[PDB]
Amino acid sequence: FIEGGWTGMVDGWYGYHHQNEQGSGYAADQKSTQNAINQITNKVNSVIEKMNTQFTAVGKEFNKLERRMENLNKKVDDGFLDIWTYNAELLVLLENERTLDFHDSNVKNLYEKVKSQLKNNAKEIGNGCFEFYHKCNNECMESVKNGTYDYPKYSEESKLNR
Amino acid sequence: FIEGGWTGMVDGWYGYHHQNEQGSGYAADQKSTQNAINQITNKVNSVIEKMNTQFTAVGKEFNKLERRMENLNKKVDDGFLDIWTYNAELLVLLENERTLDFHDSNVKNLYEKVKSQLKNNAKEIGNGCFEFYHKCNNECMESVKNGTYDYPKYSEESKLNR
Amino acid sequence: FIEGGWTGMVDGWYGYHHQNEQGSGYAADQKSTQNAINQITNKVNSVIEKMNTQFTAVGKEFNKLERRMENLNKKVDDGFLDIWTYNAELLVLLENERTLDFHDSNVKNLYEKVKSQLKNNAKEIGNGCFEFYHKCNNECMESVKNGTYDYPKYSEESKLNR
Amino acid sequence: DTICIGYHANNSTDTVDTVLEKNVTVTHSVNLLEDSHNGKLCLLKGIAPLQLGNCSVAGWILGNPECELLISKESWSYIVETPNPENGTCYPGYFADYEELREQLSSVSSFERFEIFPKESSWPNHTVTGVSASCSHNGKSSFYRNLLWLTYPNLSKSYVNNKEKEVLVLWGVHHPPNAYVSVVSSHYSRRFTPEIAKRPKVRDQEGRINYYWTLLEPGDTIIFEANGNLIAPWYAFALSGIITSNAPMQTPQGAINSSLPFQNVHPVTIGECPKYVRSAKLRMVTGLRNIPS
Amino acid sequence: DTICIGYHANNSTDTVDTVLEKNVTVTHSVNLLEDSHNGKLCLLKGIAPLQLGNCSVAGWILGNPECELLISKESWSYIVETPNPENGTCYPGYFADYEELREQLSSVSSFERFEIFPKESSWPNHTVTGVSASCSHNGKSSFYRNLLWLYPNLSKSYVNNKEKEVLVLWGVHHPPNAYVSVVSSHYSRRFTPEIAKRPKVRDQEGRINYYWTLLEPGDTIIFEANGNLIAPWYAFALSRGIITSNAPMQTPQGAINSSLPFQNVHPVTIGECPKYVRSAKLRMVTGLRNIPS
Amino acid sequence: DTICIGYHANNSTDTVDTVLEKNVTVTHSVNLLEDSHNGKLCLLKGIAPLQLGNCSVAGWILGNPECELLISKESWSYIVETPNPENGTCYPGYFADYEELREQLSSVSSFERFEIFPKESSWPNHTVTGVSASCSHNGKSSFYRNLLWLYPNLSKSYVNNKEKEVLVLWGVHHPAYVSVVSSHYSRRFTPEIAKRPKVRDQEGRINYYWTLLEPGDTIIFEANGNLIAPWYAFALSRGIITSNAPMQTPQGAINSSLPFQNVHPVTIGECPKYVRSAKLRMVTGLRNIPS
Amino acid sequence: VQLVESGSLRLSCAASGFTFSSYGLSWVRQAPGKGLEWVSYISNSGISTYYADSVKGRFTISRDNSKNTVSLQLNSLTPEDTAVYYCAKKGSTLIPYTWFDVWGPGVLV
Amino acid sequence: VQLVESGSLRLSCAASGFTFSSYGLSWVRQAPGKGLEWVSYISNSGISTYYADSVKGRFTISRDNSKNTVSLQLNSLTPEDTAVYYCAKKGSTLIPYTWFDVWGPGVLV
Amino acid sequence: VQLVESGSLRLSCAASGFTFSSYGLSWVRQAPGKGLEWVSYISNSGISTYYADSVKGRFTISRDNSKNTVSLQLNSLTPEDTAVYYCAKKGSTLIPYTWFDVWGPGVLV
Amino acid sequence: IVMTQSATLSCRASQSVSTSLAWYQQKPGQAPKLLIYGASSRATGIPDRFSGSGSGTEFTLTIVGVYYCQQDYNWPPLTFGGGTKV
Amino acid sequence: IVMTQSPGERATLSCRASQSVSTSLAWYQQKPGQAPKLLIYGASSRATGIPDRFSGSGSGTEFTLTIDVGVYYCQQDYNWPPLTFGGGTKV
Amino acid sequence: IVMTQSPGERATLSCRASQSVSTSLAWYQQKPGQAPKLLIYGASSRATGIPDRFSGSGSGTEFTLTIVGVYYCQQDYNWPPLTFGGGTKV
């Protein structure tokens, strides 16, 4: 349905590539962008925090006769290192998965949202793109973008153009 | 969809707000409610358990001539504390995230269920609301709730009349 | 929507049970099969490794007069044991949760994929089953399976079969 | 002829948090963090814990006069000691190997006080009297209650461990700042000697007297000896859990009555207890959001 | 014609559990929990492990007569010891610091047994002979095999020629009825003889304690003694684990041949092995559910 | 007209990984793994660290001639020692314990060198002169700087007039009844003449001990045949790294806020936690593939 | 917001200044000396409808959207029906909640 | 559950006592002196159909839902067709599985 | 791929050898000695359309799918229209990208 | 459902209604104007001097004229209370 | 596809085909005069209502019945359009 | 939008715009008589099939070709008013 992003849309995360008899180009949305960036920044802030360390004098010294203590210390240290490695790796992988899936879900949501207010005045073509039986100027673009597309206004149009 | 729970319908988790020429009010749906509550309670009972400890005489004493032991013990104790803090925080946050989306998914499932129960005898309006083109008495509420809607029976006048 | 797998279809993961006037039987898809098996094997691989242990002489000895050392050693050992038990149990439960939902999502995706071609030549019946107003021979099975269904070719069918 | 879907809502906040957002309300929730406190310390196992306030564990085991020896406490799940000891060691001295006895005494919940040696028969050749001004009990001179000063023959005595239980033996030697003392076990030996070096004055006393302690099992027997001085034992705390607090009649700062796994009270505790954690609020969600439509 | 969707199903249970519900079947699964056991302990690294049953490690290193000294075992990845020792210390004695020798032999896998000292020419004045009834081997009186009982002021040293770590163990006689001083270049001690009475054990009336030091290449240790000494005769030269159990020729309870990470057999093991865990069923799901229709 | 949907894409790789695939590109990412290194170790707290190059901590505390005693360093967050000691202990000897001392000096951050004993007041009866050829300084014979060689039954005692902890180090000559006596600590060593090997061109040793006393304490000394009297108490004011870098971590300095580090774990002060991993990148955007 | 009403018998309530297509209107009669009395109601779309208990059959309600006006076919002019008639609009589009905020001048028949 | 069958020659099988609209009927012929024989079948909806190999065209099948009864036109009579004809119903609505449980008296043509 | 063009005046561009129903055609004029000039364009479906600024109204474009052929009405001939006309096809089905890869012999009006 | 009526007021019902209640005021001649809607929520724009609270078949206002209390739980049969002299 | 068939007598019977069929098999019995009744449906899975005296087992082109005098029938429902009923059995 | 243009010899050419266009650019070559044939498309990216001898680079209102007749550069950002550049003698 959606595979790769366009090289256009210099700024933003989600947007529309409108086209009409008078002009064409790109356009970026706001609310979805703000929500996505805010949530991702919150995720990053949460993960980076929750980590604190005191004076960790890790280096320790032991005498010749106390090799038992040396082995005990090595056991403790290597165990801690392994535990932290495993934990961090699992956490990072999980976070990556849960951000990618969320992004995909959000774009799908925007798609169905735009679908909502164009029940019949348009006709799906594929690849997440639409077109209207009626011709409209630039202003209809803003109307759909803001959600103020008055369906009755263009409903009367002769949808029997076939 | 999910906007805000009605103050009415005191008991239950989901339900319908039926309205008809004869009466109006609320009504709960037990079949999904019992499943949801049972599953969530089972999950809580699962997470709460598995935590058991023996006689943990955490308090330990060390002589003036053994500061090394003091430092080692402090290291191990603080490490355990930090590890457990991080683990528990992550687990609780994960379960909180996983519960709400599950509830929303169950609600959406009930919505598509009622949508499937009948197709053209009604007409979607929005906010998870439907209305029948025909008129039916009180019993049709029970009929739809059980899923026993009889499409040909109420096909009467199920046509363009507006 | 789909509850139990058929006893037939010895080999495969997802497939179709085509029926036509000339013949009937099963048929196994491959693309989604390869994707699912590859992803699941990748999950299994990811989990299995990341577990390396050195020449760990866990067994330790302690003198009669050093019982403090015995207590410390048992403390560290049982703590590590409990931590690893909890971590592994949580990880395995999470993976078990995360595999089944992915399988179901893949099945739903395939169902919508087949829905895509047959927009009105067919008529949904339920339980993920479809049938066409027009009759077609075996080759239409291959056409739909590969997605090459020629909608205009059979669009002209006298859909007014009622 | 209208149907709509929805969920239950109420008039409660029950704030919860998640990665989705912080400070979000919920219809129903369960808190995994507990804060109940100030409960007076009670019988953990329906028995009186060994309370020995106003005196240290050392003096308690060593018959300090002040605490009256707490003659009768058969069962004690745990020991609660005053954080600041009082008259914890009547006579100044250097007690060795310490905290090993303290860790040993954290489990046994029954004692059989047993006069190991006869104070009347087996040793009249030498005198038993003796007191220290710094150890004058209740305003009158005295020495101790658990062990015996001695005041010459070459003392040679030995227990045999007839009772089929472990028997503890504590003692010390006299360091006069103005003697081949040798405990001898079947499989343990030592050989201390007397010292004469000058000492500073502490607790009004001129010197010190150091104490040791050995453990022996059934089927064993230990034989003593000394020439110049010896501190004979007179009662073995035959065997068969430390908290510092000041609350009246389990944690150092009260009691907890709940089934949650996590605690915010001080981590140190005795017996099975919820794991401690450094966090403020850990509330789980068991319902749906609560915001009026 | 008709089209329908579905997934292959079979006739196996393979019970698994998940977040939602307990005891759910699955078409295909993989178990990460292993239980294979009782495989006879074998060569972990294709070499014979040092087996010294019927005698303790101490007696083994100290030439106890009973075990015949296991003269030839060049390669030994690990040591398996009988949980209950037999004749583990021929002569009653107090052997110290048994956590630094027993931890030194957990790695070395090549012993260059080497007669450290000469017993033919350098000890003519010394009366090398003597036996203990408690150490009478095979019904005949003898002393030991790794060192010899033993008046001039004995003085001797090691030539320290071989470029490898050399070990030396010894002890001192404790007549139950002498400035022994090992002197390393960077280690010193000074023990003395005791004459205190001892109880009877193993039919003997006292003990004789043993010590041991480790010296690297380029060192030189010089001995001395007046009243008694236990000279060494074999330095177990090293090439820098323990398993208490018994079974016919790893883990204390057999062998495991699997690649899974988690194990249910007893945690303690030697060499690379799966991590242990306290759980019964850890099965992963690699397929789909299995329910007909 | 036409309305399409999509997301912005760019021309960067920024490789990341996840369960779906290894080596997958992304428009925007953040790395939680840091590798900045080789920055010269500097003032962690804006103060000069106590470098002890060319000499060991032992000799540093015990007035070894070679390092000139580093007379002035009032504050030092951490101590950096050369991994390979040089002339670390002039006289061949054997200390008491160098962990209960080496570990206590990892927290203090200042000192007040105080001539604990007056070397001209109340012991002319002694013979303060003395020297060891093997301990000659700058090509000329000398003994030490933090304590002096040394026959009546001498005695002496400090009183701890200053309200701070005072440290006292000393030893005895191993070619008597040396007995340090604290208010709550005691020991009694004796001399021992016995054959020993030659090391550092000497035929014996002298072993050093050290005790700590708090305010209200007044230790008292004594000896008959030998005594290594102290001459300067390194009075306290309350980490160790081995490195060779010129003028933190043993191998440089790190300036970043990420939590995980790939440089050697050992460090002093607040620093990112170490971990054994190569690449830890988080995805803060969307995938990047054209078309 | 603006609303007007003018007028068997015919009665229509015209209004403007808002979105007439996304709201539900209603009607309320008023007695000469007593309180107000509900008479009817319709939903925004124009399908669901109700009527007063003692009126079902005679008074009819119809709505459109082009002219943003609604009409009641006041038939069966029983002489007891001498009641002051008004016009009103709901306060929100959500079905469960209701309150008549926008109130017009009304009509004295 | 009840079923009855009565009857070129026309033939019909009337039935009731269940949901006639959510099942698939069928037909099986029986010879005077040997086993049975399948003749035809139809799906529940009425859009998909099949026929016996030796009959395609000769016999036809039609169904309704209001009357809950089906019928086969059964044209082109021929003496070898002197077979006993029955009526039967599937045992479940799932396509892959099949078995004729509800069996009726049948008809002797 | 095969394409051909033949031809107020009428002009048509027949083509084959590919999926004509899933692509957008176009038309470009050519001057006698100058560069090429765009004319018009139509999407694959046959709804969205555009035209040259200086032609809107004069020349109209229509398409079919059965014949895999298009045609410009090219009405209202004018003296300046002495231009060489061509045929072309887009290089992909994605809207944002565009390039005329398939090129035919064109026509000299 | 039925209603009735008695600065403060008091509206009493014979059945349990949670929140579907409001309040309407009017002086003679002028059309009634909205007052606090919901159980007690105060409508905007209108002067805030008017107020009230109470629920569960028991409602009361808080402060010449007339007022009205209306219930909206059982919908099809709406109902307005009586008068309120002051 | 084709089918075929074979006092306190021990009642057993077998039905075989020339192709592999996993489970789409059943069993139909009929006494003379009356209509055939249902029997074990599926791969020998016991039918309902019928007396439990009747039983059987077998699969994979080899099916058997384990046990009322007369005839019985085995039917295969794998390849659907051309249904087929087996022969007539005796006892 | 508007456009314009500038054996053993190095064939290099430049084409420039008066506005910013990122990638929607291509290149068309044609000898006299024969119809124009494709060339590098999508901001100098090589077009398959055709000989690889031809190439170029450049972007952002400045484009260049790196290699006898004429050539054309086309811009496709603002769509409805397409435009072709002028001739390019060599």
Residue numbers in the entry:
A (entry chain B), B (entry chain D), C (entry chain F): 9 to 170
D (entry chain C), E (entry chain E), F (entry chain A): 11 to 55, 55A, 56 to 79, 79A, 80 to 93, 93A, 94 to 117, 117A, ...
G (entry chain J), H (entry chain M), I (entry chain H): 2 to 8, 17 to 52, 52A, 53 to 82, 82A, 82B, 82C, 83 to 100, ...
J (entry chain K): 2 to 7, 19 to 75, 83 to 95, 95A, 96 to 104
K (entry chain N): 2 to 7, 15 to 75, 82 to 95, 95A, 96 to 104
L (entry chain L): 2 to 7, 15 to 75, 83 to 95, 95A, 96 to 104
Quote the study on this structure.
Structurally, HA is composed of a hypervariable head domain and a less variable stem region; the latter contains several functionally conserved epitopes targeted by heterosubtypic broadly neutralizing antibody (bnAb) lineages. The HA stem also contains another antigenic supersite, termed the anchor epitope, which is membrane proximal. Similarly, macaques produced anchor bnAbs with the human-like NWP motif. Both bnAb lineages were functionally and structurally analogous to their human counterparts, with recognition mediated largely by germline-encoded motifs.
At the sequence level, these antibodies use homologous VH, VL, and JL gene segments and maintain all critical residues defined in human anchor bnAbs, namely the CDR H2 Y58HC and NWP motif within CDR L3. While CDR H3 mainly engages residues within HA1, CDR H2 and L3 loops make contacts with HA2 near the base centered around S32HA2 and Q27HA2. Comparing the per residue contribution of each antibody further highlights the similarities, including substantial BSA contributions from I/L55HC and Y58HC of CDR H2 as well as the CDR L3 NWP motif.
